[PDB]
Amino acid sequence: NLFASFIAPTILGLPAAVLIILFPPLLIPTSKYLINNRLITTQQWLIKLTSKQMMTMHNTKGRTWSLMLVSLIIFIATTNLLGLLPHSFTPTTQLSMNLAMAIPLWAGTVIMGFRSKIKNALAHFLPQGTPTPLIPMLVIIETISLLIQPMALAVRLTANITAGHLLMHLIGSATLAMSTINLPSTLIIFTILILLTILEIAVALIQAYVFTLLVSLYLHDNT
């Protein structure tokens, strides 16, 4: 009854969760022209400013992912922002979807660190200026954290959009309860919901930039 906005949506027995995951790309029109409209002029600028941010820090092999790590910050920042609409089912609150964006991009990042350049990837586990006599303890950290980075991504994003929606939905129910009670209090609980919606707008973008930065930093440490 409380987690209702996270159950897979179905209308007329049809799994409507597919027309919701495939919609974000519909808000990004493209054109071959040279001078287009305001939408594609602002979007092609954001993609320019974004790609120059995540990708500048990479070498030539890391920059071959400049289509992936840009088409990923565009898909997470548009799925989150389409979740703040009323009653909307944002599929980034799903541990299934988030585990499907996290494991491949991570596994495909350490594999290229183990299928090639492996002898160099063996040197990140042991920092440069490290004395020896307590190495058999540090080996646990750099591996067990590596083995849990793919689950850090998918849960840092799941637990931040879920908890952001749960809070806005509870504080919302508060204003509904104090509506039939002292009303000058309703307006102070509501203005908390407004400052909270401006926060959930920012955390809708920040959680997209951090997800695609930590996938970038994993890549930078394997190319």
Partner 1 sequence: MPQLNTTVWPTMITPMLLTLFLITQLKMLNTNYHLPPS
Partner 2 sequence: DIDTAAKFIGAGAATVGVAGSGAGIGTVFGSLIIGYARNPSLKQQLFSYAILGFALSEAMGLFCLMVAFLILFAM
Partner 3 sequence: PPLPEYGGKVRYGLIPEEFFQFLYPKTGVTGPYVLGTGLILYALSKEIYVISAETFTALSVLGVMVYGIKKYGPFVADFADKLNEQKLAQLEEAKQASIQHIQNA
User: What does the DSSP 8-state code read for residue 1?
Assistant: -
| Binding status of residue 71 toward partner 1 by CB under 8 A | yes
Contacts (Cβ under 8 Å, ≥6 apart) of 189: 171, 174, 175, 178
User: Which of 139, 159, 170, 192 touches ligand BQ1 by CB under 6 A?
Assistant: 192
| 189 near partner 2 (CB under 8 A) | no
In angstroms, the Cα distances linking 70 to 48, 53, 208 are 10, 10, 11
Nearest residue (CB) to ligand BQ1, 147 versus 188: 188
Q: Please, what sign has the CA dihedral across residues 213, 101, 117, 129?
A: positive
In the stretch 149-188, what mask flags binding to ligand BQ1 with x, by CB under 6 A? ---------------------------------------x
Q: How many CB atoms are located within 10 Å of the residue 101 CB?
A: 20
* Residue 109, token pair as written in the block: 């990042």
CA-based angle 174:180:183, to the nearest 5? 80
Pick the binder of partner 2 from 156, 175, 178, 197 (CB under 8 A).
Answer: 156
Pair 81, 191: CB distance under 8 Å: no
Q: Kindly tell me which residue out of 37, 41, 42, 48 binds partner 1, with binding defined by CB under 8 A.
A: 48
Min CB(186)–partner 2 separation in Å: 18
Q: How far apart are CA 83 and CA 76, in angstroms?
A: 11
| Contact pattern for partner 2 over residues 1 through 40, marking x by CB under 8 A | -xx-------------------------------------
Contacting positions for ligand BQ1 (CB under 6 A): 188-189, 192, 195-196, 199
Contacting positions for partner 1 (CB under 8 A): 3, 6-8, 15, 17-18, 21-22, 24-25, 28, 30-32, 43-44, 47-48, 67-68, 70-72, 74-75, 91, 93-97, 100-101, 158, 162
